Amino acid sequence: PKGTIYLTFDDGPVNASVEVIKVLNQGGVKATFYFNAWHLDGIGDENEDRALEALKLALDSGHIVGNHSYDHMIHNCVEEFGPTSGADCNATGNHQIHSYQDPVRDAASFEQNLITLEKYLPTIRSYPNYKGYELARLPYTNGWRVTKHFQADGLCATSDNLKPWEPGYVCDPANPSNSVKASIQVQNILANQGYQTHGWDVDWAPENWGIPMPANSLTEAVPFLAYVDKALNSCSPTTIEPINSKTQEFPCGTPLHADKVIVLTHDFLFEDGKRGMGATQNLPKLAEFIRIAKEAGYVFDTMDNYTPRWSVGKTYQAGEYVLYQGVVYKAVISHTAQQDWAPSSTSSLWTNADPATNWTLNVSYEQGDIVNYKGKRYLVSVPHVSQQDWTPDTQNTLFTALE
Amino acid sequence: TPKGTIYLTFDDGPVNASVEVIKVLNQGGVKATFYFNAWHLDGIGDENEDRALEALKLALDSGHIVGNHSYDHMIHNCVEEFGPTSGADCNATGNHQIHSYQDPVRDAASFEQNLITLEKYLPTIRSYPNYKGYELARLPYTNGWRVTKHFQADGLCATSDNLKPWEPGYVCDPANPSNSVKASIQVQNILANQGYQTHGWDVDWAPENWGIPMPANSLTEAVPFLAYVDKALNSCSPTTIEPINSKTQEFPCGTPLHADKVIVLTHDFLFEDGKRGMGATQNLPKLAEFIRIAKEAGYVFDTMDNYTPRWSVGKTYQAGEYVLYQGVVYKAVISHTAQQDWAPSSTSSLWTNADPATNWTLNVSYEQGDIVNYKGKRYLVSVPHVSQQDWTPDTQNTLFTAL
Numbered sequence: 001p002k003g004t005i006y007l008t009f010d011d012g013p014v015n016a017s018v019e020v021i022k023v024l025n026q027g028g029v030k031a032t033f034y035f036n037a038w039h040l041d042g043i044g045d046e047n048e049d050r051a052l053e054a055l056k057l058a059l060d061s062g063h064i065v066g067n068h069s070y071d072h073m074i075h076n077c078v079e080e081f082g083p084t085s086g087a088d089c090n091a092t093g094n095h096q097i098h099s100y101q102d103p104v105r106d107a108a109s110f111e112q113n114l115i116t117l118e119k120y121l122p123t124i125r126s127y128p129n130y131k132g133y134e135l136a137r138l139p140y141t142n143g144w145r146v147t148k149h150f151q152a153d154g155l156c157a158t159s160d161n162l163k164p165w166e167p168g169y170v171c172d173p174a175n176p177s178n179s180v181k182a183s184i185q186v187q188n189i190l191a192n193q194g195y196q197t198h199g200w201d202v203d204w205a206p207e208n209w210g211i212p213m214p215a216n217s218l219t220e221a222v223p224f225l226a227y228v229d230k231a232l233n234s235c236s237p238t239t240i241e242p243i244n245s246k247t248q249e250f251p252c253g254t255p256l257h258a259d260k261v262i263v264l265t266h267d268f269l270f271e272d273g274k275r276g277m278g279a280t281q282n283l284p285k286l287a288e289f290i291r292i293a294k295e296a297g298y299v300f301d302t303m304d305n306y307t308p309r310w311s312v313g314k315t316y317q318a319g320e321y322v323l324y325q326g327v328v329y330k331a332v333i334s335h336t337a338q339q340d341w342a343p344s345s346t347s348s349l350w351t352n353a354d355p356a357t358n359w360t361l362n363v364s365y366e367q368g369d370i371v372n373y374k375g376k377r378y379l380v381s382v383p384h385v386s387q388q389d390w391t392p393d394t395q396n397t398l399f400t401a402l403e
Numbered sequence: 404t405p406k407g408t409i410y411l412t413f414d415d416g417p418v419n420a421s422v423e424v425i426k427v428l429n430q431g432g433v434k435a436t437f438y439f440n441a442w443h444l445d446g447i448g449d450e451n452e453d454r455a456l457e458a459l460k461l462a463l464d465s466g467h468i469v470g471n472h473s474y475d476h477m478i479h480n481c482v483e484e485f486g487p488t489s490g491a492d493c494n495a496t497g498n499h500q501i502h503s504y505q506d507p508v509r510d511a512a513s514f515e516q517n518l519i520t521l522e523k524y525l526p527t528i529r530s531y532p533n534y535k536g537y538e539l540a541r542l543p544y545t546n547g548w549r550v551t552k553h554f555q556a557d558g559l560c561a562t563s564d565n566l567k568p569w570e571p572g573y574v575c576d577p578a579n580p581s582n583s584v585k586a587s588i589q590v591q592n593i594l595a596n597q598g599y600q601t602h603g604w605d606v607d608w609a610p611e612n613w614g615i616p617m618p619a620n621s622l623t624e625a626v627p628f629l630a631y632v633d634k635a636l637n638s639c640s641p642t643t644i645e646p647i648n649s650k651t652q653e654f655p656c657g658t659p660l661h662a663d664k665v666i667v668l669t670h671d672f673l674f675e676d677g678k679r680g681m682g683a684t685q686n687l688p689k690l691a692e693f694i695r696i697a698k699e700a701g702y703v704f705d706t707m708d709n710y711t712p713r714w715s716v717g718k719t720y721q722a723g724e725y726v727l728y729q730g731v732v733y734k735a736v737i738s739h740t741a742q743q744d745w746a747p748s749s750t751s752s753l754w755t756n757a758d759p760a761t762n763w764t765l766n767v768s769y770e771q772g773d774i775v776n777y778k779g780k781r782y783l784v785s786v787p788h789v790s791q792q793d794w795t796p797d798t799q800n801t802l803f804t805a806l
């Protein structure tokens with residue numbers, strides 16, 4: 001395979017999601033859907049009466065469902081959140097403005113998302129492809145919490161004053177907006193609940209948002225495949241445009257990102273409706289893209305596999321990463337995986353490399369890491385692998401409490 | 404060896420009274436488990452609770468275990484519309500135990516809301532290893548257990564559709580439980596599919612006399628309460644306990660995991676000088692004394708996170724013995740001594756997963772007649788077997804029969 005494409009669809013489940021999924025199924029591929037459950041409540045200002053149907057269809061078809069927050073942060077676009085808020089924020093177009101404010105409340109939206117999904121589809125946890133409590137992606141934000149050493153933020157994703165295209169708009173990644181700062185804190189809060197978050201490499205979007213029916217200008221399949229070819233092994237989260245889509249400090253060349261392209265797109269771009277004739281014009285682009293991408297040697301996978309599953313029989317090199325039971329591990333020593341020697345909190349063969357900051361067992365801590373433990377912050381003074389006896393409040397040779 | 408293990412469990416905190424309870428436990432040199440309802444943090448729980456957050460912090464800083472007792476103690480099912488006054492409204496009627504569970508999906512959701520509220524008021528709470536809000540739960544009103552796949556049982560008369568246990572004409576039929584009970588059974592199953600264990604109790608430290616104006620004053624004295632604990636030790640109390648709504652009728656008497664252990668239920672609010680009596684002045688001394696004399700009698704105190712004993716390297720396990728490892732219950736396949744690199748897991752030959760859940764799961768020893776959920780469908784285990792990845796119920800029409 002020349003690479004692996006991860007088709008990721010944001011902002012469903014909506015009516016438009018249904019035909020998208022059928023195109024995927026016909027194409028013989030699985031995708032990842034980052035869902036906002038407010039559509040299930042009928043308050044998301046989309047054609048969304050088939051939201052539940054779409055959710056079930058996504059899950060019955062084997063696609064992965066991940067967590068895009070309950071309301072896409074629309075509570076931070078309006079004065080008081082309610083059933084008309086999506087339409088209000090759509091009226092103003094202030095989505096990217098003050099998008100994150102109180103990061104605790106904003107992170108709680110992701111958990112509210114689990115509540116609502118599990119409300120409308122009480123069986124959802126019986127689906128192994130339901131990953132709502134494991135995989136997430138922040139509204140507006142090309143931000144990543146993949147592993148302890150694969151993390152980076154969208155430093156100008158959202159603004160305190162002006163939308164990006166506007167004159168005089170400033171973006172200083174070194175002194176990011178308050179919204180960006182808050183969004184970083186959300187990332188951290190989620191990572192401490194065990195989420196990975198993933199950004200994207202390429203965004204399948206209207207080439208022109210200024211024309212009527214802008215969804216019609218979704219990149220045609222052939223040139224889109226060119227964009228994908230260009231993103232492959234090219235650290236495109238740093239070079240992608242527009243600016244609010246960049247991940248400025250993305251660890252170019254980080255091993256898990258090799259030979260992979262994450263495509264972001266939006267279900268709503270594939271309906272015939274307020275944005276254009278997206279079903280008529282864009283469903284065949286999706287279909288053709290899948291066909292010609294396969295032809296060209298790409299395979300398609302899902303974000304539960306973006307960090308590969310630990311596999312019995314496979315030989316691992318030290319430093320290689322796996323996902324095992326939702327936790328990221330990094331191989332300590334090269335070896336071949338066998339049945340009883342899975343990664344764990346006590347394995348000598350692996351350390352826990354989750355992208356989290358709370359003190360955790362069997363983590364290779366590095367000098368300069370700051371960890372949280374029983375409500376305090378501690379600076380790691382000497383590198384070591386955490387173990388139960390070496391708690392930060394009792395090991396001042398390893399940790400120093402910060403003020 | 405100790406005479407047995409006592410698990411002090413305090414329900415309905417965090418409130419003001421919690422603080423002095425915690426201090427006495429601390430002076431007693433013991434750790435307890437608090438099953439909390441976060442509505443007190445919002446100040447709508449109708450208790451003296453301005454120090455709720457102080458109490459939560461103190462509980463966690465003192466090393467006590469925090470477990471999930473749901474956000475509002477199901478008060479939303481005691482009133483027409485849940486709101487800031489519903490606690491008082493329900494205290495006005497005394498209908499806590501009537502229609503206590505209705506929509507199990509919604510009631511189970513209160514346990515997740517509890518997580519949200521706790522993590523809102525104390526954003527650092529996940530940095531406490533003693534925070535087990537997302538792992539350990541107890542249903543309001545209900546002596547119900549989801550411990551292991553072979554250690555589960557319900558409070559078949561815990562809650563009612565009409566009358567309370569003391570009202571004449573009240574009838575408890577375990578064989579044909581109330582609707583509220585059936586709903587609570589579903590809540591147990593929902594939480595268990597989210598990874599919770601739930602535990603009931605063996606003895607309840609409560610007013611000896613609810614008919615006086617200051618009922619808290621009649622909390623059993625230390626010596627005779629110790630006698631109750633003694634009586635409970637190895638004698639299947641959940642079946643014999645009174646009142647009837649506190650029974651666990653089908654409790655697996657003699658089940659090994661329950662041997663030599665006594666779980667004590669009590670309530671923080673019984674240790675307050677206030678509307679229930681002189682709880683602080685009268686009951687804090689009883690608590691202190693009970694701790695002293697229990698120890699002198701050979702008992703040790705432990706927390707509910709250890710009720711299912713944590714897996715520990717170096718310990719020898721026997722075939723069929725249960726452990727907890729990373730919040731998951733496992734059951735030993737053969738007698739062996741535990742080694743660092745051979746931990747229980749989804750792929751371990753030494754252990755099977757024995758969580759008390761019903762969703763189809765890897766490496767579970769299924770029995771004939773077990774019913775599992777998988778991708779939205781229910782399957783009868785026709786051929787008992789240990790589940791593996793290639794034997795998903797949708798593809799194994801000999802091992803499983805679709806219902």
Ligand SMILES: CC(=O)N[C@@H]1[C@@H](O)[C@H](O)[C@@H](CO)O[C@@H]1O
Nearest residue numbers: 011044045072086089090095275
């Ligand atoms: C231009 C456009 O379609 N923007 C949409 C907005 O309509 C929607 O409410 C939001 C949440 O899904 O996502 C995007 O910002």
Ligand SMILES: CC(=O)N[C@@H]1[C@@H](O)[C@H](O)[C@@H](CO)O[C@@H]1O
Nearest residue numbers: 415440448449476490494499679
């Ligand atoms: C008689 C008594 O004290 N009942 C209490 C009730 O007051 C309280 O609101 C509820 C939830 O905390 O727990 C108990 O049912």
Ligand SMILES: [Ca+2]
Nearest residue numbers: 194195326327
């Ligand atoms: Ca995880």
Ligand SMILES: [Ca+2]
Nearest residue numbers: 598599730731
């Ligand atoms: Ca668990």
Ligand SMILES: [Zn+2]
Nearest residue numbers: 010011139140
């Ligand atoms: Zn989005």
Ligand SMILES: [Zn+2]
Nearest residue numbers: 414415543544
């Ligand atoms: Zn209670």
